[PDB]
Design a binder for this molecule. Structure first.
Ligand SMILES: [Mg+2]
Ligand SMILES: [Mg+2]
Ligand SMILES: [Mg+2]
Ligand SMILES: [Mg+2]
Ligand SMILES: [Mg+2]
Ligand SMILES: [Mg+2]
Ligand SMILES: [Mg+2]
Ligand SMILES: [Mg+2]
Ligand SMILES: [Mg+2]
Ligand SMILES: [Mg+2]
Ligand SMILES: [Mg+2]
Ligand SMILES: [Mg+2]
Ligand SMILES: [Mg+2]
Ligand SMILES: [Mg+2]
Ligand SMILES: [Mg+2]
Ligand SMILES: [Mg+2]
Ligand SMILES: [Mg+2]
Lengths: 394, 131, 63, 107
RNA sequence: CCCAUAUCCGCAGCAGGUCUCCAAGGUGAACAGCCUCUGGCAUGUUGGAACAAUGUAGGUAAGGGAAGUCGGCAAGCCGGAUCCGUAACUUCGGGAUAAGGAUUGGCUCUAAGGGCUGGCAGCCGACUUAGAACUGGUGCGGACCAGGGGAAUCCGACUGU
RNA sequence: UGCUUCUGGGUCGGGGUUUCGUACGUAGCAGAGCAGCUGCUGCGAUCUAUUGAAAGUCAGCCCUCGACACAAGGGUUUGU
């Protein structure tokens, strides 16, 4: 018989199977559709989740209760040191979908990128690309490379670069670099390859890919939580306390007929560590990394036009469980997937952004740099020492 | 024109709150909440600025044994604002109103939340202070 | 946004920190954390708690 | 330099972090023995009884946070043993653990 | 000789059953519970490593406060002692710890409450009670021990089986 | 994920951060009082100073490059 009272089903069957992601690095399933009238540009980037803070800003939203008023907004800091372009891969449109056509690699590849090609770097002789590299060094091989580039100009429809991360600048234990294909959108195919060929072994800062107040998508793997029951995994109602044989369950997992458990019934299993793509995460700030200028370390990348204190984005004691963000960073409104240290894929929007919230301009008045290791109450050590005064340690 | 934002709801159905006016009612017993569609097993809940339907359990006999429209003006559950402030009050209070939102009494005891004052100008005019 | 001072400990509260308390008698207080809030609500006098600003002033510790 | 003596501070606190009350001291011994094997590379580790007493001096759960120990690698006199060196771990009573380093001890 | 979480009966070294004697210190009203000495034991027919779900057994939860459910089931509240105070009804015995309040630590004192020898003098002593000052971040029956209450209806007087 | 570029991680130490809330000892003509000796000496909860002190703090916090040793290894397989 029909269920007595209506209620929506728990969870989305659109995110099935709730399994562990086969990839640790977020995959770009769709790149923005190419518009041959725009200048050649990149459409994605790699960053690492450093941590979260909050900011103060004055909203500009006519007809709103917060128009011309200051609000506190949570933000995510993603450390995004420049990537290095190491190869070009071409694709040909076929009646079976895109097919990889031709991959070229730069003459030089750093050891960070080469570590990606090995399962045991310690035990390896580091022979990767040691014979491929000799093609750039001789006339015969060079004459074959440009032929490969010419072939890519004739036949390929999609061009992507092979950029990797620079792990020697991050504070993480990991030294193996994250290597991903980024699609080159913009002008003709020939202009794409000319653009890409000039950038082999070059560095690309995040500021060349994204801009202030831009709405982007963050792709990554969520925090893993292991084996979870239906109550936690699917958020079903707890059964009464009197239930025999457990109450963190789903009471009926199907009707007599069909004489089977359906794919749409809540079951126990893996929770978290799922691949996810989240859209419309506004960029609040593209921060500059530390610089040594005239023998002075310039690091006041957390100062605003209204707060002139010489402080960096790092909170007192550093980012908990991450380290110190001394590279360029992107400040994203709200939360993103992953743990601290998780590699996040930044991607340009697949939509047309014509909305006041999408077109609003962000003017940060304050960035909170208090310690996150406790209930921190000082923005800077100078501020703390001035309040406390001398101590016994002194 | 400016719509109120979501706030934490601290008063489900069955909450007995103080009556902070001079009607004669001492406390208000919430039997429902305006605008709640809800879902299975979820109790309708109310926060500052919300109009609810209530009965008087303690107070003048003429006010008892019938359903009044009321508005919550203070709540003990702390709710966030857009400036990041978490405000809560020492007690849960309301005032009896009519469907138009104008008070049945004339005076309010204690402060009145800014969230409710902006929404109900008739309650706002009677508020001794605003929080 | 102006910085409040904790009604108990005298420390200053930056935006998006602590809570605000409004009593039925119309007084409004700001608390840095639940530690300061708990001491105030248990009617502890801040002038006797060694780590507050009112204690150190009374005892001339900074001076 | 097969025969050598060194003094260490072992942070027992981070070794047994999160262990159940009834397994805390028994695991400190296992962590000391594990520590001694790592430093001296000697599977035959003999913990002095006084060191056993120090680890248990506060019961099964309120184990000392830090403990100073001496690791003496000595030759084994048992020709029947498969190990030719053994490590002896002795307790070192210290008043303070501040600034204590890893030092060589020469006899 | 065992005399019972292994010598007896339950098919067994079975969490069951099976008659007795002796019986320390502390706290406390106490053969209560909690800690210890004499005496005894090795965790109860195995260990190691992990710390997922679901369990079993314990806890804690903002705001609300029975809206849950057949039903407050379960849990929770109360709880010792001193001082005050105590209704309907009643078979005048009760009801009654009705209900409802206040107090409670530590430290330093004050007063009172006795015996023996020869309205006094001296010499001995046993724990109690009351009062006061001071004192701590209002914490104080600090663990343990330890009644939720009220208004009614039905049935059976009660204790007992 | 890491496992020699005078380099690497690790251990201990140091610093930052942060939690609680002011350590032991010592001194005090601070302390309600009481006791003994002719103002002193004892007992005394507590108070004050030393003293935002002491203690803990990655085990899944942040930075050291101070001390210590270790690190160039081992096993099983795989061929158009
Ligand atoms: Mg239906
Ligand atoms: Mg049952
Ligand atoms: Mg934190
Ligand atoms: Mg229901
Ligand atoms: Mg056991
Ligand atoms: Mg055993
Ligand atoms: Mg047995
Ligand atoms: Mg058993
Ligand atoms: Mg609750
Ligand atoms: Mg509560
Ligand atoms: Mg009901
Ligand atoms: Mg129901
Ligand atoms: Mg019950
Ligand atoms: Mg009665
Ligand atoms: Mg009758
Ligand atoms: Mg009977
Ligand atoms: Mg019989």
């Amino acid at each position: 018989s029909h269920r007595k009272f209506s209620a929506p089903r728990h969870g989305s069957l659109g995110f099935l199977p709730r399994k562990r992601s086969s990839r640790h690095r977020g995959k770009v399933k769709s790149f923005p559709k190419d518009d041959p009238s725009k200048p050649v540009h990149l459409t994605a980037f790699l960053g690492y989740k450093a941590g979260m803070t909050h900011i103060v800003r004055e909203v500009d939203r006519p007809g709103s209760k917060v128009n011309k008023k200051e609000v506190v907004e949570a933000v995510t800091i993603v450390e995004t040191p420049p990537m290095v372009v190491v190869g070009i891969v071409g694709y040909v449109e076929t009646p079976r979908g895109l097919r990889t056509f031709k991959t070229v690699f730069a003459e030089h590849i750093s050891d960070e990128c080469k570590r990606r090609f090995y399962k045991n770097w310690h035990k390896s002789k580091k022979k990767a690309f040691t014979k491929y590299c000799k093609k750039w060094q001789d006339d015969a091989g060079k004459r074959q490379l440009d032929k490969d580039f010419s072939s890519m100009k004739k036949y390929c429809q999609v061009i992507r670069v092979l950029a990797h991360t620079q792990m020697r600048l991050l504070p993480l234990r990991q030294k193996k670099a994250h290597l991903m294909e980024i699609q080159v959108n913009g002008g003709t195919v020939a202009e794409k390859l000319d653009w890409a060929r000039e950038r082999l072994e070059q560095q690309v800062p995040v500021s060349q890919v994204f801009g202030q107040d831009e709405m982007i998508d963050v792709i990554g793997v969520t925090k893993g939580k292991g084996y979870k029951g239906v109550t936690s995994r699917w958020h079903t109602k707890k059964l009464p306390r009197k239930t025999h044989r457990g109450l963190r369950k789903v009471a009926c997992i199907g009707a007599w007929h069909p004489a089977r458990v359906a794919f749409s019934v809540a079951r126990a299993g893996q929770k978290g560590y799922h691949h996810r793509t989240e859209i419309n995460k506004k960029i609040y700030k593209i921060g500059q990394g530390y610089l040594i200028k005239d023998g002075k370390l310039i690091k006041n990348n957390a100062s605003t036009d209204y707060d002139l204190s010489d402080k960096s984005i790092n909170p007192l004691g550093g980012f908990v469980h991450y380290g110190e963000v001394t590279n360029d960073f992107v400040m994203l409104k709200g939360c993103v997937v992953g743990t601290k240290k998780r590699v996040l894929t930044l991607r340009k929007s697949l939509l047309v952004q014509t909305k006041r919230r999408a077109l609003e301009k962000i003017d940060l008045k304050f960035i909170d740099t208090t310690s996150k290791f406790g209930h921190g109450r000082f923005q800077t050590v100078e501020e703390k020492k001035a309040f406390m005064g001398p101590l016994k340690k002194d | 024109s400016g719509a109120k934002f979501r706030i934490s709801l601290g008063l489900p159905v069955g909450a007995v709150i103080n009556c902070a006016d001079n009607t004669g009612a001492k406390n208000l017993y919430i039997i429902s909440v305006k605008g709640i569609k809800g879902r299975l097993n979820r109790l309708p809940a109310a926060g500052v600025g919300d109009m609810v339907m209530a009965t008087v359990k303690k107070g003048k006999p003429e006010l008892r044994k019938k359903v009044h429209p009321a508005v919550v003006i203070r709540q003990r559950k702390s709710y966030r604002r857009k400036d990041g402030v978490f405000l809560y009050f020492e007690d849960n209070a309301g005032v009896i109103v009519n469907n138009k939102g104008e008070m049945k009494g004339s005076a309010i005891t204690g402060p009145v939340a800014k969230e409710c004052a902006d929404l109900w100008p008739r309650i706002a005019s009677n508020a001794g202070s605003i929080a | 946004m102006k910085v409040e001072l904790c009604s108990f400990s005298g420390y200053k509260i930056y935006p998006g920190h602590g809570r605000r308390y409004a009593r039925t008698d119309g007084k409004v207080f700001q608390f840095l954390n639940a530690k300061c809030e708990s001491a105030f609500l248990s009617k502890r006098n801040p002038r006797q708690i060694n780590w507050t600003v009112l204690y150190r002033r009374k005892h001339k510790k900074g001076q | 330099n097969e025969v050598v003596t060194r003094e260490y501070t072992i942070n027992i606190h981070k070794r047994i972090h999160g262990v159940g009350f009834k397994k805390r001291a028994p695991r400190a011994l296992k962590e000391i023995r594990k520590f001694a094997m790592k430093e001296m590379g000697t599977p035959d580790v003999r913990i002095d009884t006084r060191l056993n007493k120090a680890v248990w001096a506060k019961g099964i759960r309120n184990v000392p946070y830090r403990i100073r120990v001496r690791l003496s690698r000595k030759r084994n006199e048992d020709e029947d043993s498969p190990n030719k060196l053994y490590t002896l771990v002795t307790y070192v009573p210290v008043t303070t653990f501040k600034n204590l380093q890893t030092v060589n001890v020469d006899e």
